[PDB]
């Protein structure tokens, strides 16, 4: 060759460089990325209470041997567009909504109440062009106070259309189906719906089961075999 | 406070409208100046020769 | 017409040898164009160019390609018109033939076994195989397939050293009958047991999903019916070949089996013309590939 | 960034001797490692060389067969195996650290060095130095020209020609690497030129930490081949 | 009532501006450059492929010795190569894997980065400890950061997601100055090659000329539609182009304060990711994410060549200060240096 001894030592220099990046790039496969996601009002911070400045928060934690990293990224309040594309790639979206903000509103963008917001949030996230094939964690937490108000106020105020009683049972059903109604890609994707309840270890054990689910779904796609 | 925010915003508008502006021909033949006065000097309009290519294989 | 190395056995006497050329003939231009439209829809879509399962699927392609068409040539040369030619040149267009077909056997199990680590280690198949190694495999298993093909061409024949010939190939001993059984039979009892431990834990993990709340079944039903699929395409072509194989080294020996034996190794190009319906039509990415090319 | 040995001594003719050279303050396993001996009234030699993470292991004439040089990334610490010593390996070694990537300075720290004592009882590039001892005088220029046998430049337009500058009592400095370069901490008065074969070290305004012996080391291909050693001396 | 009487100053005030550009409306640039000589039919190869991240590369910078490159990607690495060889000089561990912009010291002894984490952190290359340490975190920000700049060893210039850019100082750790008056967000910037000015465009189609001293905004260019990404100063420096989200390029003039060519092309749509110019900026080459870069005539309005190489869209994109190549980087795993 016509390297001489100092180049022959600057590609074995690369060669352990390369050896590095490969190693470190199989340490960081074995974690699985998810991506918060939300009003803000829904309580994920909560979920982050359930699972165990700077624009983005990662929750690392694990759970049955398997590593995940929680990608918190609302805090950034910028426009969503010029950087979403960066989580293109995460294995899941853990979307978080809060049941007990379906009478609530806000006024001070638009008058309009929080669930229709969350579900324009659902519309633009679960019909994105990057999140095209990344399933989606939907959490719906603080059952117990949307019950305790549900006892009293009706889902009427949200929904116009609601042909059904104050059981909590049947109005979460319909919430479930209207959040799961705004999939346009129920082929290409999937969406597991969750009751956020207060008993440890059951949060984090939807999660483990959702995403052993997807990536066995996405390994399934890649092989060929779907 | 959006009344310091307008007047802000008028007079940054102000300051940008009373600046001189060259003409589009001394402009343009000042951009053709710069391209043909260094057109040898760019390697990428021109196939580089292999020796003085540095990156050739 | 005895025993004891003779030639010219061929039992083809009858108007069979207009069937066997019809069925081969359709076989291999079906085959051929099967084959040549995986070769495109891989090769111009980097989609299906970077997965590393889609070069084990070209692998097949290529190898059920050039079986194709060297099976047909020397079947046709062969049971046709009867052409008799030198121990070295049959020797070396079956070593071909069997270096396609045992390549071909390869690639499916190195399909399985990719099919089978995507389903047994499902975090760790992403850092497993990756397109290099997925190259490795398939140079290795096409090596190992043209050594194979190529040790009865040096000293296997049976005509250097003086051991009992098979009749139905000539020039080939009994003893690399036995050997590219076991061989085959092995790469196939491997394919078996992936597919069949694919379908084990995808209904395991479809009963864990039912029994916790995680799900609404859908994945061990379809990857079943994909599955029963390729493996009763395995069996139907080659269970009564590896039949009449052994039948031939280890049976009586009668004189209508070799009659039986063209016509079940014409599924040879049955399983080379129904590889990419079941290999690359069943993927959804190729499907869409060669949709939108048109 | 620390580099001190430790284990030498008299030992007999024939016998075994280790030295460990202990590195602290700097990343050990990013470090090609090197052992550069000299010998009382001579100059430098290489004597064994290791890379970074063990990846090649270079010997000598001298060396191969009778040495082994290794290293320890998490003790941080450089060894030397040395078997049937004779008499010529009497020497002050050296442990050296080095580094290889494009703009980098190898070479560029030596260790404090150790003393081996022995009682009684071929293709390469040798670096030619007209002059082993100038009297010089402060506040002039002064000029130091290194030859070689073989011509240093390579396809890459590096000529691999290294200035080392050893005060006494005190361990080997580098001063200009590559034969253009400046290295860390030297003043901005050394500077180096060359063409090919013919090399001219200048040295202007000359200070009393001038003093010392001129090396002239190549850096072509291996074993590498210090200079005979030019001391500067004041009147 | 009262900001609104202001309105009917303020846009008046704009059409004075617009009065301005009937100072400037004698003609075109595309009248002018008639009758020249165009550059041709450009066949230029991909000659090294850098191919050690594993991630989506979002940034690179060219070193001014032409020889060095860094590299920034969505992994936690950022990697220094040699492009004359294919050496990586050095790899870098990040603390977040989430940068979308990097640059390359003029000096070359410090490297920079930053995105969602809010942190141009400055890295130093040249030590006596022999690897790469965080020499200064420049925290402050609340957007995205988007661009980042060298202007020495001292002075860097940030543009963040944050509608404001920022010139800060390495030693003291703090902003020396702050520009504000985009109100979309920041994303790309451009030096000037005598250094006194700065042109920067963010997400509300409005490229801003600044002064690194002055610390206001002297000129305003408008005329694209969607999110502007992409600004390159001429080697001359009184005119710069850009791209945007539309599909055009626009080459607007300091001098003349308006736009001067519109690059485009009827088969284009998925805008442009990155932009540069090429020595005496004949040629401008637009990374569009229709996963290739294209060699448009920068006085003729014609597309002289295709970079097309890329499996993924060319995020990023430059060329080295004395021409020799240009490198594109993009969302697969790849660099490639074209010449
Ligand atoms: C033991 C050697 C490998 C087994 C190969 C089995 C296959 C099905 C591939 C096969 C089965 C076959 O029956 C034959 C084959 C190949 O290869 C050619 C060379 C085409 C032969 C030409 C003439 C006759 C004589 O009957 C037999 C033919």
């Known amino acids: 060759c016509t390297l001489s001894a100092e180049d022959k030592a600057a590609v074995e220099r690369s060669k352990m460089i390369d050896r590095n990046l490969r190693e470190d790039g199989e340490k960081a496969a074995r974690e699985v990325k998810l991506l918060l996601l939300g009003a803000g009002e829904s309580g994920k911070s909560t979920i982050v209470k359930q699972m165990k400045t700077t624009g983005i928060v990662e929750t690392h934690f694990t759970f049955k041997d398997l590593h995940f990293k929680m990608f918190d990224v609302g805090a950034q309040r910028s426009e969503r567009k010029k950087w979403i594309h960066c989580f293109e790639g995460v294995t899941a979206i853990i979307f978080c909504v809060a049941l007990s903000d379906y009478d609530l509103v806000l006024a001070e963008d638009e008058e309009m109440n929080r669930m229709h917001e969350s579900m324009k949030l659902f519309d633009s996230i679960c019909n994105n062009k990057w999140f095209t094939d990344t399933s989606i964690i939907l959490f719906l937490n603080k059952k117990d106070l949307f019950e305790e108000k549900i006892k009293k106020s009706p889902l009427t105020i949200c929904y116009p259309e609601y042909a059904g009683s104050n059981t909590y049972e049947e109005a979460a059903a319909y919430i479930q189906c209207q959040f799961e109604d705004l999939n346009k890609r129920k082929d290409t994707k999937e969406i597991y719906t969750h009751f956020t309840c207060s008993t440890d270890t059951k949060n984090v054990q939807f999660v483990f089961d959702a995403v052993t689910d997807v990536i066995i779904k996405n390994n399934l796609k890649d092989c060929g075999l779907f | 406070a959006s009344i310091a925010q307008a007047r802000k915003l008028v007079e940054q508008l102000k300051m940008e409208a009373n600046i001189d502006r060259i003409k589009v021909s001394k402009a343009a033949a000042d951009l053709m100046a710069y391209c043909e006065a260094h057109a040898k000097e760019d390697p990428l309009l021109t196939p580089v020769p292999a020796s003085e290519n540095p990156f050739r294989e | ?294 | ?235 | 009532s009262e900001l609104d009487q202001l309105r009917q100053e303020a846009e008046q005030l704009k059409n004075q501006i617009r009065d301005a550009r009937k100072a400037c409306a004698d003609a075109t640039l595309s009248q002018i450059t008639n009758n020249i000589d165009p550059v041709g039919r450009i066949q230029m190869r991909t000659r090294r492929t850098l191919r050690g991240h594993l991630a989506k590369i979002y940034a690179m910078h060219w070193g001014t010795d032409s020889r060095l490159l860094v590299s920034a990607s969505q992994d936690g690495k950022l990697i220094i190569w040699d492009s004359y060889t294919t050496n990586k000089v050095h790899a870098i561990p990040l603390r977040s894997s989430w940068v979308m912009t990097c640059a390359y010291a003029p000096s070359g002894n410090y490297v920079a980065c930053g995105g969602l984490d809010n942190i141009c952190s400055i890295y130093n290359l040249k030590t006596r400890e022999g690897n790469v340490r965080v020499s200064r975190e420049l925290a402050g920000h609340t957007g995205y950061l988007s661009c980042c700049r060298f202007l020495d060893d001292n002075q860097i210039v940030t543009s963040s997601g944050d509608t404001t850019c920022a010139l800060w100082d390495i030693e003291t750790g703090q902003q020396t100055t702050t520009f504000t008056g985009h109100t979309g967000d920041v994303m790309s910037l451009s030096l000037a090659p005598d250094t006194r000015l700065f042109v920067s465009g963010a997400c509300d189609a409005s490229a801003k000329l600044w002064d690194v001293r002055e610390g206001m905004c002297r000129q305003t260019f408008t005329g694209h539609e969607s999110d502007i990404n992409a600004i390159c100063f001429f080697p001359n420096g009184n005119a710069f182009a850009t791209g945007s989200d539309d599909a055009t390029c626009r080459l607007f003039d300091l001098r003349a304060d308006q736009e001067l060519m519109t690059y485009s092309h009827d088969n284009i749509i998925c805008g442009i990711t990155s932009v540069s110019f090429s020595k005496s900026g004949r040629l401008l080459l637009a990374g569009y994410d229709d996963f290739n870069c294209n060699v448009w005539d920068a006085l003729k309005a014609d597309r002289a060549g295709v970079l097309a190489g890329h499996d993924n869209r060319v995020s990023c994109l430059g060329v080295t200060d004395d021409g020799m190549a240009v490198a594109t980087g993009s969302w697969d795993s790849f660099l490639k240096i074209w010449n």
């Open chain 4, 1 to 235: 960034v620390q580099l001190v040995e430790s284990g030498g001594g008299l030992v007999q003719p024939g016998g075994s001797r280790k030295l460990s050279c202990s590195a602290s303050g700097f990343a050990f396993s990013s470090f090609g490692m090197h052992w550069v001996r000299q010998a009382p009234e001579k100059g430098l030699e290489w004597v064994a060389y290791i890379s970074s993470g063990s990846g090649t292991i270079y010997y000598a004439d001298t060396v191969k067969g009778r040495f082994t040089i290794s290293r320890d990334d998490p003790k941080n610490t450089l060894f030397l195996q040395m078997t049937s010593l004779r008499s010529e390996d009497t020497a002050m070694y050296y442990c050296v650290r080095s580094i290889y990537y494009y703009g980098s300075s190898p070479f560029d720290f030596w260790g404090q060095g150790t003393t081996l004592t022995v009682s009684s009882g071929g293709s390469d590039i040798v670096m030619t130095q007209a002059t082993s001892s100038v009297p010089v005088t402060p506040g002039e220029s002064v000029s130091i020209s290194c030859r070689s046998s073989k011509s240093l430049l390579h396809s890459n337009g590096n000529t691999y020609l290294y200035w080392f500058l050893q005060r006494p009592g005190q361990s080997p400095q580098l001063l200009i690497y590559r034969m253009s370069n400046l290295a860390s901490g030297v003043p901005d008065r050394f500077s180096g030129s060359g063409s090919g074969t013919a090399f001219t070290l200048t040295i202007s305004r000359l200070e009393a930490e001038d003093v010392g012996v001129y090396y002239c080391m190549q850096h072509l291909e291996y074993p590498l081949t210090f200079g005979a050693g030019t001391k500067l001396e004041l009147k």
């Open chain 3, 1 to 294: 017409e005895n025993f004891m190395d003779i030639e010219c056995f061929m039992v083809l006497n009858p108007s069979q040898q207009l069937a066997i050329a019809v069925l081969s003939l359709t076989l291999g231009t079906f085959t051929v164009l099967e084959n040549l439209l995986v070769l495109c829809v891989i090769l111009h879509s980097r989609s299906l160019r970077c997965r590393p399962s889609y070069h084990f699927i070209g692998s097949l392609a290529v190898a059920d390609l050039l079986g194709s068409v060297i099976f047909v040539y020397s079947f046709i040369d062969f049971h046709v018109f009867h052409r008799k030619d030198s121990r070295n040149v049959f020797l070396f267009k079956l070593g071909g033939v069997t270096a396609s077909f045992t390549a071909s056997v390869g690639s499916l199990f190195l399909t399985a076994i990719d099919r089978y680590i995507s389903i047994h280690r499902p975090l760790a198949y992403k850092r497993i195989v990756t397109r290099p190694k997925a190259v490795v495999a398939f140079c290795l298993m096409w090596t190992i397939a043209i050594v194979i093909a190529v040790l009865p061409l040096l000293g296997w024949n049976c005509e250097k050293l003086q051991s009992v010939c098979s009749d139905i190939f000539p020039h080939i001993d009994e003893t690399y009958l036995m050997f590219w059984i076991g061989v085959t039979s092995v790469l196939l009892l491997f394919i078996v047991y992936a597919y069949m431990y694919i379908l084990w834990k995808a209904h395991s993990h479809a009963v864990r999903m039912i029994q916790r709340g995680t799900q609404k079944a859908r994945m061990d039903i379809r990857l079943a019916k994909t599955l029963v699929l390729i493996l009763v395409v395995l069996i139907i072509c080659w269970g009564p070949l590896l039949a009449i194989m052994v039948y031939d080294v280890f049976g009586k020996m009668n004189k209508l089996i070799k009659t039986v034996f063209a016509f079940c190794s014409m599924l040879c190009l049955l399983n080379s013309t129904v590889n990419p319906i079941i290999y690359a039509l069943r993927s959804k990415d190729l499907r869409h590939a060669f949709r939108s090319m048109f």
